[PDB]
Amino acid sequence: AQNPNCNIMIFHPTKEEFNDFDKYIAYMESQGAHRAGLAKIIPPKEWKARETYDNISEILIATPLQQVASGRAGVFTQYHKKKKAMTVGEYRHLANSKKYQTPPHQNFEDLERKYWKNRIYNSPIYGADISGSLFDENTKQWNLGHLGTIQDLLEKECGVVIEGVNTPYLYFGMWKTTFAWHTEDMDLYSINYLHLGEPKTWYVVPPEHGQRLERLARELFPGSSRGCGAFLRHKVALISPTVLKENGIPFNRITQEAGEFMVTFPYGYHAGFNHGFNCAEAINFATPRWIDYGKMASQCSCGEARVTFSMDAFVRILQPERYDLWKRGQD
């Protein structure tokens, strides 16, 4: 068995290997990358996502979100308070202000220590889930707006034609912006490209150990767990590496820098934080190996998780018994 300790693997494809996306994901899995739940892909030196980032300031962040925390430093929830619209140029100036900017630090480990000590005492503002793309249309390799769609994969594997579309999303971050513990909708893959700016630190639990994280979460968030049998779908709960280690939960960590891709694998729980002003692009995708995970994915039916149009069909075809209850949650 490849990668039996479930370590995060880092890949350096050549320009020739970067042509065929599906083939390279299958290669990484042949080497055991999915056992970690997360992999890093450094593009070949010949590749670029676009020519420059000099002209992005007029993108609108229609609904910036202030991430307000409750709890203790290592075990907290966050809620998202909606703020007034602002452009990317306005948000960058905000991120760089004395109130929000990254503090002085020695290295990524010192910054990580400062994040976990102090996150709860601040409320950073995140531009999230903004439909769009920063890949140039002429970038042919690993262009996250030109991937094969999940609806087409389900049709190729299972023969059933379904409605829905699959497009990328942009994220604009600042120091302390936080992504809560979660798996993807329908336990899909994700791919994330850090276009510019400061790094993103990730934490991940191997898929084979995901139920250990769920059991700890039910212990640490006992009201939330009574409210919903899949409350991590709400994307609000944070648990620090120190708390995970104290409770014996297997996990790994890695820092993504500008110009790098990360892939999350089906049922790989992940969480993390931004180091300073940055912009990322991400999208979900599927492979044949995903289908069995889609069929088994938990679902929130309490009403909180509320998701895209295209998840309807995935539930309807892969999880017909759950469909009626899940759809009541959506309506």
Binding segment toward Mg ion, per CB under 5 A, in 11-19, 50-58, 173-181, 275-283? 50-58
290 is a contact residue toward ligand OGA (CB under 6 A): no
Q: Say whether 192 counts as a known binding-site residue.
A: yes
58 is a contact residue toward Mg ion (CB under 5 A): yes
* CB 129 to Ni ion: min, Å: 11
d(CA 79, CA 194) in angstroms, rounded, equals: 24
Binding segment toward Mg ion, per CB under 5 A, in 56-64, 161-169, 212-220, 257-265? 56-64
Q: Say whether 184 counts as a known binding-site residue.
A: yes
* CB 321 to ligand OGA: min, Å: 27
Q: Say whether 300 counts as a known binding-site residue.
A: yes
What's the number of CA atoms in the CB half-sphere (13 Å) around residue 28?
Answer: 31
d(CA 84, CA 146) in angstroms, rounded, equals: 32
* CB 259 to ligand OGA: min, Å: 15
Q: Is 270 helix (H, G, I), strand (E, B) or coil?
A: strand
Site for ligand OGA in 192-251 (CB under 6 A): 192, 200
d(CA 329, CA 304) in angstroms, rounded, equals: 8
Answer with the entry of ligand OGA, Mg ion, Ni ion, none that 221 interacts with (C-beta below 5 to 8 A by kind).
Answer: none
Q: Say whether 234 counts as a known binding-site residue.
A: yes
67 is a contact residue toward ligand OGA (CB under 6 A): no
Q: How many residues at the interface with ligand OGA, by CB under 6 A? A: 9
How far out from the chain centre does Cα 177 lie?
Answer: 13
d(CA 150, CA 286) in angstroms, rounded, equals: 6
Listing DSSP states for 9-64 in one string gives EEE---TTTTS-HHHHHHHHHHTTGGGGSEEEEPPPTT--S-S-STT-TT-EESS-
Binding site for ligand OGA (CB under 6 A): 171, 179, 190, 192, 200, 264, 270, 280, 282
